[PDB]
Design a protein around this ligand. Structure first.
Ligand code: GSP
Ligand code: MG
Lengths: 176, 205
């Protein structure tokens, strides 16, 4: 019935907003917490009721030393990048995968592409093209998930709510 | 002076010395709070600590109060505990852009210490703290508070699944309607990150 989820990924990739929207608050515009406080999610999948304790983390390298305090006895990891940041995707295999596999050996990983609303966003396209980049394509997310041995790949938008419940359903299936 | 736990070893040592033999009901009350403190604290702040407004929270709030008001449920030592907060702890006119490029806005900072430094206040909600400075992400947040908690202060230490849905936070939960005095509001540079943080020294009265 009781499981532990830890969410990780680069600074500003949308971790906190994803947790806030899953808690059924509106998408935060003015008052954006740095790290979300305790919130257990009630989730039912395949006839089983789960109380999923969600642990937010600070994604910036400056807080690397603090993050290990969140890791013990984790049942599932949400490893995030932003669809508007190819750089955040490249940190999946370079930083997040080695870290999580060291502190959470053999714990299931869901690879999560955040800010899906920005894939078909003009400003995002135009800013990214200035550095010869474009939004992460779904195929690239899927390939990365396969490459790291994730349970699955999911995309979502905290801003529109698209995919948010599905992220946490899959995490719960992986936690069981 | 006050005890300060500097590492896991010291925090665990101190933890074992704290009262833990609550009743089933008392543990479930404490643990329920840890699942999501918002319905407790928001309700208490919104209604100035009056419970009759909502029978459901009244019942939960009275059950938790009972666990924390128990005879043995108190701190033996003088101890320093910690929590982080977003900038709007000082009012909805502030948000987290008060820190810009790791620098605290001096104008807004001076308004805050003018308004709150030296203030005695009663918290309608409960107060969640940690005995370890590193144990939240309180170093991440724009405001960090140190509470000087005098021996005999009521509360519960929680670091195991029977008492909290988030074991490993080395939590000391303080009762609702706790009165504290803000002794100092100041700015400090974190040596690791090289960014400014607003620091608060409060004493539990
Ligand atoms: N367009 C869009 N923007 C989003 C989405 N989710 C978050 N954001 C924006 O991204 C920014 C950072 O989001 P946040 O949730 O604070 O990141 P984080 O991963 O918690 O960052 P950190 O605390 O490790 S530094 C915010 O300005 C927020 O508005 C989304 O789904 N779509
Ligand atoms: Mg965050």
């Amino acid at each position: 019935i009781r499981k532990k989820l830890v969410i990780v990924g680069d600074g500003a990739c949308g971790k906190t907003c994803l947790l806030i929207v899953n808690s059924k608050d509106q998408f935060p515009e003015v008052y954006v917490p740095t790290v979300f406080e305790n919130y257990v999610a009630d989730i039912e999948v395949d006839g089983k009721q789960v109380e999923l304790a969600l642990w937010d983390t600070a994604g910036q390298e400056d807080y690397d030393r603090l993050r290990p305090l969140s890791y013990p006895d984790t049942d599932v990891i949400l490893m995030c990048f932003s669809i508007d940041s190819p750089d955040s995707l490249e940190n999946i295999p370079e930083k997040w995968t080695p870290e999580v596999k060291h502190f959470c050996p053999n714990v299931p990983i869901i690879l999560v592409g955040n800010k899906k609303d920005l894939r078909n966003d003009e400003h995002t396209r135009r800013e990214l093209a200035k550095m010869k980049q474009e939004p992460v394509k779904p195929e690239e997310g899927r390939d990365m998930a396969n490459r790291i041995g994730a349970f699955g790949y999911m995309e979502c938008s905290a801003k529109t709510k698209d995919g948010v419940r599905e992220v946490f359903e899959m995490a719960t299936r992986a936690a069981l | 002076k006050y005890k300060l736990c500097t590492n896991k070893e010291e925090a665990d040592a101190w933890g074992k010395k704290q009262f833990n033999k609550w009743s089933k009901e008392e543990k479930s009350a404490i643990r329920d709070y840890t699942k999501n403190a918002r319905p407790y604290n928001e309700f208490l702040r919104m209604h100035a600590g009056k419970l009759d407004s909502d029978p459901t929270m009244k019942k939960k709030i009275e059950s938790l109060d009972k666990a924390l008001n128990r005879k043995e449920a108190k701190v033996n030592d003088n101890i320093k505990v910690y929590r982080g907060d977003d900038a709007w702890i000082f009012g909805k006119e502030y948000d987290n852009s008060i820190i810009k490029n790791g620098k605290v806005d001096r104008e807004k900072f001076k308004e805050i210490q003018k308004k709150f430094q030296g203030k005695t206040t009663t918290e309608f909600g409960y107060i969640s703290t940690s005995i370890l400075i590193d144990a939240g992400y309180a170093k991440t947040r724009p405001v960090m508070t140190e509470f000087k908690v005098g021996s005999g202060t009521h509360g519960a230490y929680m670091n195991s699944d029977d008492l909290t849905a988030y074991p490993g936070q080395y939590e000391l939960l303080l009762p609702r309607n706790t009165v504290y005095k803000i002794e100092k509001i100041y700015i400090a540079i974190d040596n690791n990150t090289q960014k400014e943080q607003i620091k608060v020294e409060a004493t539990i009265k």
